[PDB]
Amino acid sequence: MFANDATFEIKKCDLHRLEEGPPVTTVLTREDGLKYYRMMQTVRRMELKADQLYKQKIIRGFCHLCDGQEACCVGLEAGINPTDHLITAYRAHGFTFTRGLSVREILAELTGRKGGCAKGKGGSMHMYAKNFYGGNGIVGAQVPLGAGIALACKYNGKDEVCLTLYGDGAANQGQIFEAYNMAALWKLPCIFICENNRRAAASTDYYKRGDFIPGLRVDGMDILCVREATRFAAAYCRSGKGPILMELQTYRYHTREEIQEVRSKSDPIMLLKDRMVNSNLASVEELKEIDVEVRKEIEDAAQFATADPEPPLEELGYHIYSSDPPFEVRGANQWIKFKSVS
Amino acid sequence: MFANDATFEIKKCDLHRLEEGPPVTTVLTREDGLKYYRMMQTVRRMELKADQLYKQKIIRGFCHLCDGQEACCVGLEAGINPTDHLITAYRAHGFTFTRGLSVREILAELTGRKGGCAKGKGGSMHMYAKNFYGGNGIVGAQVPLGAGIALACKYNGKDEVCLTLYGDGAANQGQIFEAYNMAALWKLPCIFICENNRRAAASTDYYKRGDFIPGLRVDGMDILCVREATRFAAAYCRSGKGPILMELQTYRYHTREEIQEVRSKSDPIMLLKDRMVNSNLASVEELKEIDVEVRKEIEDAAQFATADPEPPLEELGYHIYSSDPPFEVRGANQWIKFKSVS
Amino acid sequence: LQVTVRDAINQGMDEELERDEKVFLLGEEVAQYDGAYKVSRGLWKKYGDKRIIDTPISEMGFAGIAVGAAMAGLRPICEFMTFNFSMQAIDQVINSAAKTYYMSGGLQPVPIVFRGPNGASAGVAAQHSQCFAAWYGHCPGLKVVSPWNSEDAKGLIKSAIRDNNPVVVLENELMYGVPFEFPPEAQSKDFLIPIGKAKIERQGTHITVVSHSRPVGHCLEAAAVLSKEGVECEVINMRTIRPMDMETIEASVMKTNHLVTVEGGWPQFGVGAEICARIMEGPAFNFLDAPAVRVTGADVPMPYAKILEDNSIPQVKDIIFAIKKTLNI
Amino acid sequence: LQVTVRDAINQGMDEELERDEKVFLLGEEVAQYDGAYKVSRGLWKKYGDKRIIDTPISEMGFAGIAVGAAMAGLRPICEFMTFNFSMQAIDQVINSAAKTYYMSGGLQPVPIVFRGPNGASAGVAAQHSQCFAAWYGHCPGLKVVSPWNSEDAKGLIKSAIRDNNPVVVLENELMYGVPFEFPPEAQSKDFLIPIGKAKIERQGTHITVVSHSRPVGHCLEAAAVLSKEGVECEVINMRTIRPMDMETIEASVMKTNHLVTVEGGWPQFGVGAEICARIMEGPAFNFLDAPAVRVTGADVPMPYAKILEDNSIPQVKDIIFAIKKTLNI
Ligand SMILES: [K+]
Ligand SMILES: [K+]
């Protein structure tokens, strides 16, 4: 017999240009915390397999992992509806999954196979899903993209919001400020999330770079603060008050020892695991066995993803333009013609 | 009999991240402020001559006049050396002059004649002088440029600063924030100057836009504190403190009637006039004579600038590359060749 | 009826904006100011804040914001004061807009339109004078059209709004106040000029003259001068830069046996180059009785003084000199 | 000695830095990290923070800084991680560096070098595989080189630094670790390669094969496969995209009577287009016994799948097929 729900303290946010921030106390239901664990574990295991498929060279080109950051994508997806929008830079395996796609299609696009979510045309950086505007290879390019998805929101008035993410590397992009200004100016429901997984900036207070836009600093290893500060920021935006910065302080696992003392004293899966255990929300065996289901999940997908045939050559030209009649595309020399269908 | 010099109050600047700003009191030496007059006056009459040359159509394309702001461009030259660096955008007539160029070569460049300072190649927006990196027409591009010139200063270490100016219109250029960042980050001797002469920006507190970079807000109708500020900023930079922002508040003349109250309550030239006079630093008739002198310099120049013949068409391809042997340049079709010499 | 090129475009957007509430205009000075070149005159007044949006001077930003809206599902007309300015946003156009449908294996389309004056004006000097036809037309996933006259302008602007992919429209500012005869079939709010097709603005049998934008006008001037000595030119208005209608140019070269391209912007790796390269690779190479040549802008950044600038853009003289050089007459 | 392209470049930058203190290097991970591609290895350790500056990721801004320094007398080497990232600074290169010498009436030179890897890499997908030969090649007041082997990269990077105007150097990532015999005269520190001059890499008589950067290697491969069959190619390595050495290509054409150009960029408006257009317009034309063909990149945004990618850049057979086609053998 397990509790149904418990109550924890989450760290308190720092504020900038805000009166009151998200509550320091929250409720985790049993059946919920069970769902957040299976998601965190899946993203973790997923990236582990990616990383392994990638020292083996089945995965070519870029391969950015987000293991260590699972509190971020799962907790964010905890705080928003499926009808809200999210767009990120290239570290997007976690978000592709929380936003709908299956570990099957994600791994198969990583190994560039026909079964992949973009038919193997995209690779690791460009994956799209229902309301997910992908990862974009160009640093900060997605922030004005996000501001625009936000503008569309207001434009249809459905009280949907936009999570527009960028890491601390991209926090000095000129475009970013160009979007802070318009966002405030047009009061766009855009939440500008800065993933700060820890020189380059003259100022490392990121939640404040917005300047005239209010921001909050959140702890990104606690799935609960993330969900909290997200529901808070969603609230704020939907109430028509315009844009907000939210610095998610986090840590990507990929000296290699600073990487260590940050894992025992705060994997973000271990934290949620200890909470559930210490408050009778779940048993250590329950969780240990969800791992076994997740590990077998990822194993079968990975298997499909290395077996799956490459796309056919004759489709190299497809999907250039949308809704057009078929046409030909020139290849390496003029005698090479590739059909292109929308 | 006459005053050798006098003491005046200037408005005190608003401060951003600074404990003490520039003095609220200064000393205009009658002899200096006789030169500040003749200069301002020269810029005013030139800009008015240009405007008339332009309404006539002897000047083409762009013609950006800086009248009302003469206190800025003369005020600036008064608190920096000949050997410091100045770059602005396209409203660069005042500066070109205060930086060394004769009214003749400025006028002649506007009317597109060989006797122009750039042999008719450049026209209104692209005038270059000694340690003036001129006017630039891509809004905002001048700012990272000037941060560069500042890099150059620090790098030679000869205590020279660099005044990088932009208009409240360009204040939202992404690159400007990229340039504030590296400026701060490497402590460049760069003074960022926003000529704010009053929908576009969610914060019209330009002197604070630099965020981590300290700023001050000046009254740009008053050549006295403009000078003071500039001495204050220049000195700040020389002593290694790094970059700094100056909002220069002003009002260009180029209904016609808010323009009218601004002019009779605070023309930069009028204000200086009532100060020179109402403290015996100079005579209304003394000033009435230099008015007659400048009228003649302008008349001499407009005369030269409309009498000088166009540039020869055999020099169209000159000055593409510096320091190379001569070569040919293709004109309208492959049989038209033009000689290019460095 | 007579409508200036400016008005033809303004009609087009007006019919589009009415027909579909997904459609919206944004750029600098497009709204209250009536347009930098009065191209959107009165649109803000009629459709409001929501639909006609004045932006600050933040090109990389608003181009970004436009492309975003298009991805979320709106149909933004994103105006650049002039295309020299788009160089700051060129990356949102090439990398966010133009390659996205494809990277997503057909999952995510981007119905944006980018428009503004392009190429040379009158005494704006080097940083405002640049042609971009060749740079854009170079990129897969884009469509690039370059209208000449009123009728072109209203058709290709409606076509592009209705198109579902990113489409860059290169207007010409010196064309804006040129009036043209406006056939009644053009005033129709069903007018559409299909992208990818050229128009033959003058049948002829001696030489083929191909051109796009303002200089199409000057080829019609050179052709009237010439048929006074019985040389008949075939003048082709390209209209689309990508994907160009090379068939048409080939048909015509097979008839005339000669070819001249007249384009506005710089010579090297320019629009002429591509028609010329194609012409050699294609079937019509063997009908060519003399080498095809190119008439371009002079190869320098654009200078200021009137005489210098007047010799930097092809003039009717140079089109004729070239044609005669080709026809060896 | 055999030195790799990566090492060649390093030698060049190091020697030039040593020779002149007005010369510095800025860019992303150039300093501590040792080069994003290990190209600037050890330079920071040897010249310090004044001379090797790590920059934040702010292309539009740091390109613009280098140009400022340049305008003020400094001699900056400005690096872009890949040239795809240059799309953000492109305004700064074109509008501030390239046109300035001319706009100032020769008052204001801009001795700046822009270097980085360009074009296709390997499964870096559509946004990090673009070629820019064509676009930069297009602009007056800029010089544009595209080096192939060690010898080239060291010579050219050295002449670019010495040059007094903005030079754009299009390196290539796959060439980085490829090693080459490095003649004793190239190990010198006065080893200089004149910009504006192609190199015949292989004497031949049956056909001219002009190419630039990486695919030059695949041409030599083709040429060796094909001589086993009695067909000789003159293979030419442009080196320089602008001002490209057309004399050399014509002279070879006058002997061979055939021309195939080969390049990794997109096809239309590319480097191959300007070369043919030039052959046709010049005196080499009449020597052609068959039309000049172009072999280029496939006209798509670059895919990810290994098989699709492979047919997106030109393979050694594709070259052989166009050579055979042209000689109708
Ligand atoms: K569209
Ligand atoms: K140089």
Written as one letter, the residue type at A255 is T
Cβ burial of D289 (10 Å; 0-12, 13-18, 19+) is: exposed
Please give the method by which this entry was determined. X-ray
State whether C188 and C202 are in the same domain.
no
Which token pair is B125? 């927006």
Which token pair is C201? 């603005």
Contacts of C190 (CB under 8 A, 6+ apart): none
CA distances from C236 to B152, C208, C217, C247, D164 (A): 53, 7, 11, 12, 43
State whether C155 and C267 are in the same domain.
no
3-state secondary structure at position B63: coil
User: Among residues C59, C79, C250, C263, which one is catalytic?
Assistant: C59
Chain D residues interacting with chain C (CB cutoff of 8 angstroms): 60, 84, 87-88, 90-91, 94-95, 98-99, 102-103, 125-127, 130, 134-135, 137-141, 242, 266, 268-274, 276-277, 280-281, 285, 291-294, 299-301
Sheet holding B14-16, edge to edge: B14-16, B215-219, B244-249, B190-196, B162-167, B85-87
Dist. CA A62–CA D136, nearest whole Å: 27
Find out whether D193 is annotated in a ligand binding site: no
Nearest to C319 by CA among C257, C259, C252: C259
A113 contacts on D by Cβ (under 8 Å): 305
Dist. CA B318–CA B118, nearest whole Å: 11
Q: Are D260 and D322 in contact (CB under 8 A)?
A: yes
Q: Are A48 and A103 in contact (CB under 8 A)?
A: no
Residue showing tokens 């403290």: B279
The continuous run of DSSP H or E covering C145 comes out as strand C143-145
User: Beta partners for B329?
Assistant: B338
Residue showing tokens 């700060």: A196
Query: What's the CA-to-centroid distance between A132 and ligand 2, angstroms?
Result: 45
Q: Are A64 and A169 in contact (CB under 8 A)?
A: no
Angle between helices D271-281 and C271-281 (to 10 degrees): 70
Which among C58, C304, C317 has CB closest to B122? C304
Q: How many CB atoms lie within 10 A of CB A328?
A: 12
State whether C129 and C203 are in the same domain.
no
State whether C39 and C179 are in the same domain.
yes
What one-character DSSP code corresponds to residue B129? B
Dist. CA A272–CA A262, nearest whole Å: 15
Dist. CA C10–CA B73, nearest whole Å: 42
Written as one letter, the residue type at C129 is S
Instruction: Please identify, among D194, D220, D241, the residue that sits at the C-terminal boundary of a domain.
Output: D194
State whether D217 and D189 are in the same domain.
no
Written as one letter, the residue type at D274 is E
Q: Are B233 and B191 in contact (CB under 8 A)?
A: yes
Protein residues with C-beta less than 5 angstroms from the ion ligand 2: D 111, 163
State whether C165 and C208 are in the same domain.
no
Dist. CA A240–CA B257, nearest whole Å: 39
State whether C93 and C242 are in the same domain.
no
Q: Are B113 and B128 in contact (CB under 8 A)?
A: no
Q: Are A332 and A324 in contact (CB under 8 A)?
A: no
How big is chain A, counted in residues? Answer: 342
3-state secondary structure at position D80: coil
Find out whether C112 is annotated in a ligand binding site: yes
The continuous run of DSSP H or E covering D4 comes out as strand D2-4
Rg (CA), chain C: 20
Q: Are A278 and D273 in contact (CB under 8 A)?
A: no
Nearest to C46 by CA among C17, C69, C23: C17
What one-character DSSP code corresponds to residue D76? E
**CA nearest to C51 within chain A:** A155
Q: Are B98 and B47 in contact (CB under 8 A)?
A: no
Round to the nearest angstrom and report the end-to-end CA distance of chain A: 56
User: Beta partners for D168?
Assistant: D114, D144
Which token pair is C267? 């010579």
Nearest to B85 by CA among B139, B40, B129: B129
After which residues is chain B discontinuous, taking C to N > 2.5 Å?
A: 198, 254
Residue C147: cis peptide before it, omega within 30 degrees of 0: no
Rounded to 5 degrees, φ, ψ at B309 are -65, 160
A331 contacts on D by Cβ (under 8 Å): 298-299, 311-312, 318
What one-character DSSP code corresponds to residue D127? G
Query: Which ligand is closest to the CA of D76, given by its number?
Result: 2
CATH classification at residue D269: 3.40.50.920
Within 13 Å, how many C-alpha atoms sit on residue B80's CB side?
32
Dist. CA B100–CA A118, nearest whole Å: 62
Rounded to 5 degrees, φ, ψ at D259 are -140, 130
Written as one letter, the residue type at A163 is L
Q: Does B200 touch chain C (CB under 8 A)?
A: yes
Q: Which region, left, alpha or beta, applies to residue B105 given φ > 0 means left and ψ of -120 to 50 means alpha?
A: alpha
Cβ burial of C188 (10 Å; 0-12, 13-18, 19+) is: exposed
Residue showing tokens 């001696």: C206
Contacts of B335 (CB under 8 A, 6+ apart): C321, C322, C325
Nearest to A253 by CA among A71, A93, A65: A65
Question: Which domains occur in chain B, in start order?
Answer: 1-342 (3.40.50.970)
Top residue of C59, C308, C311, C316 to mutate, by most chain B CBs within 10 Å, is C308
CA distances from D89 to C99, C208, D175 (A): 20, 40, 25
* Nearest chain B Cα distance for residue D65, angstroms: 4
Nearest to A64 by CA among A167, A147, A176, A145: A167
**CA nearest to B116 within chain C:** C305
Which among A172, A178, A209 has CB closest to B172? A178
CB contact under 8 A, B316 and C300: yes
3-state secondary structure at position C163: coil
CB contact under 8 A, D56 and A170: no
User: Beta partners for B193?
Assistant: B165, B246
After which residues is chain A discontinuous, taking C to N > 2.5 Å?
A: 198, 254
What one-character DSSP code corresponds to residue C204? -
Query: Which ligand is closest to the CA of C163, given by its number?
Result: 1
Angle between helices B268-277 and B223-238 (to 10 degrees): 100
Find out whether C122 is annotated in a ligand binding site: no
Contacts of C32 (CB under 8 A, 6+ apart): C44, C54
Structural domains counted in chain D: 2
Dist. CA D3–CA B249, nearest whole Å: 60
* Nearest chain D Cα distance for residue B295, angstroms: 28
Q: What string of H, E and C letters represents the secondary structure of chain A?
A: CCCCEEEEECCCCEEECCCCCCCCEEEEEHHHHHHHHHHHHHHHHHHHHHHHHHHCCCCCCCCCCCCCCHHHHHHHHHHCCCCCEEECCCCCHHHHHHCCCCHHHHHHHHCCCCCCCCCCCCCCCCCCECCECCCCCCCCCHHHHHHHHHHHHHHHCCCCCEEEEEEHHHHHCHHHHHHHHHHHHHCCCEEEEEEECCCCCCCCCHHHCCCCCCEEEEECCCHHHHHHHHHHHHHHHHHHHCCEEEEEECCCCCCCCHHHHHHHCCCHHHHHHHHHHHCCCCCHHHHHHHHHHHHHHHHHHHHHHHHCCCCCHHHCCCCCCCCCCCEEEECCECCCEEEECC
Cβ burial of B265 (10 Å; 0-12, 13-18, 19+) is: exposed
Resolution (A): 3.0
Rounded to 5 degrees, φ, ψ at D252 are -55, -45
Dist. CA C175–CA C187, nearest whole Å: 19
What one-character DSSP code corresponds to residue D202? E
Dist. CA A188–CA A152, nearest whole Å: 9
Residue showing tokens 């280098």: D66
Q: Give the distance from CA A58 to its chain's centroid.
A: 23
Q: Which chains touch A (3 or more CB pairs under 8 A)?
A: B, C, D
* Residue C212 is a catalytic residue: no
Q: Which chains touch B (3 or more CB pairs under 8 A)?
A: A, C, D
Angle between helices A142-156 and C59-72 (to 10 degrees): 50
CB contact under 8 A, B181 and A201: yes
Contacts of C140 (CB under 8 A, 6+ apart): A320, A329, C98, C99, C102, D266, D299, D300, D301
3-state secondary structure at position C143: strand
DSSP letters of D233-281?
EEEEE--EEET--HHHHHHHHHHH--EEEE-SS-STTSHHHHHHHHHHH
Domain that residue C153 falls in: 2-194
Contacts of A196 (CB under 8 A, 6+ apart): A167, A168, A206, A220, A247, A248, A249, A250
Instruction: Please identify, among C170, C194, C218, the residue that sits at the C-terminal boundary of a domain.
Output: C194
Dist. CA C31–CA C29, nearest whole Å: 6
CA distances from D11 to C130, D1, D3 (A): 38, 14, 10
Angle between helices D43-51 and D5-19 (to 10 degrees): 50
Instruction: Please identify, among D163, D194, D225, the residue that sits at the C-terminal boundary of a domain.
Output: D194
Dist. CA B89–CA A223, nearest whole Å: 49
Find out whether C59 is annotated in a ligand binding site: yes
CB contact under 8 A, B126 and C296: no
Dist. CA C112–CA D327, nearest whole Å: 45
CB contact under 8 A, B332 and C311: yes
CATH classification at residue D85: 3.40.50.970
Dist. CA B27–CA B47, nearest whole Å: 29
Dihedral sign, Cα of residue A214, residue A219, residue A223, residue A228: negative
State whether C141 and C255 are in the same domain.
no
State whether D10 and D67 are in the same domain.
yes
- Pairing verdict, β D207-211 and D259-262: parallel
Nearest to D163 by CA among D240, D104, D103: D240
CB contact under 8 A, D266 and C293: no
Dist. CA D124–CA D141, nearest whole Å: 32
Beta strands in C1-108 (DSSP E): 2-4, 23-27, 52-54, 75-79
Dist. CA C133–CA C297, nearest whole Å: 13
Which token pair is A3? 């509790």
Q: Are B59 and B110 in contact (CB under 8 A)?
A: yes
The continuous run of DSSP H or E covering C317 comes out as helix C316-326
Dist. CA D178–CA D190, nearest whole Å: 23
Contacts of A173 (CB under 8 A, 6+ apart): A139, A140, A143, A166, B174, B178, D57, D58
Which token pair is D127? 């946004």
State whether D79 and D182 are in the same domain.
yes
Nearest to A123 by CA among B109, D138, C104: C104
Which token pair is B280? 């015996």
- Pairing verdict, β D259-262 and D293-295: parallel
State whether D72 and D204 are in the same domain.
no
Dist. CA B30–CA D15, nearest whole Å: 56
Q: How many CB atoms lie within 10 A of CB D328?
A: 8
Dist. CA C80–CA C117, nearest whole Å: 8
Q: Are D309 and D298 in contact (CB under 8 A)?
A: no
Dist. CA C260–CA C234, nearest whole Å: 10
Query: Which ligand is closest to the CA of C66, given by its number?
Result: 1
Q: Does C124 touch chain A (CB under 8 A)?
A: no
Dist. CA D313–CA B222, nearest whole Å: 64
Size of interface A-D (CB pairs under 8 A): 129
B203 contacts on A by Cβ (under 8 Å): 184, 211-212
Q: Which chains touch D (3 or more CB pairs under 8 A)?
A: A, B, C
Q: What is Dmax (Cα atoms) for chain D?
A: 60
* Nearest chain D Cα distance for residue B144, angstroms: 5
Dist. CA C173–CA B276, nearest whole Å: 50
Dist. CA C62–CA C51, nearest whole Å: 15
Residue showing tokens 């009028």: B270
The continuous run of DSSP H or E covering B302 comes out as helix B284-307
Dist. CA C210–CA C232, nearest whole Å: 14
Dist. CA A249–CA A230, nearest whole Å: 13
State whether D133 and D158 are in the same domain.
yes
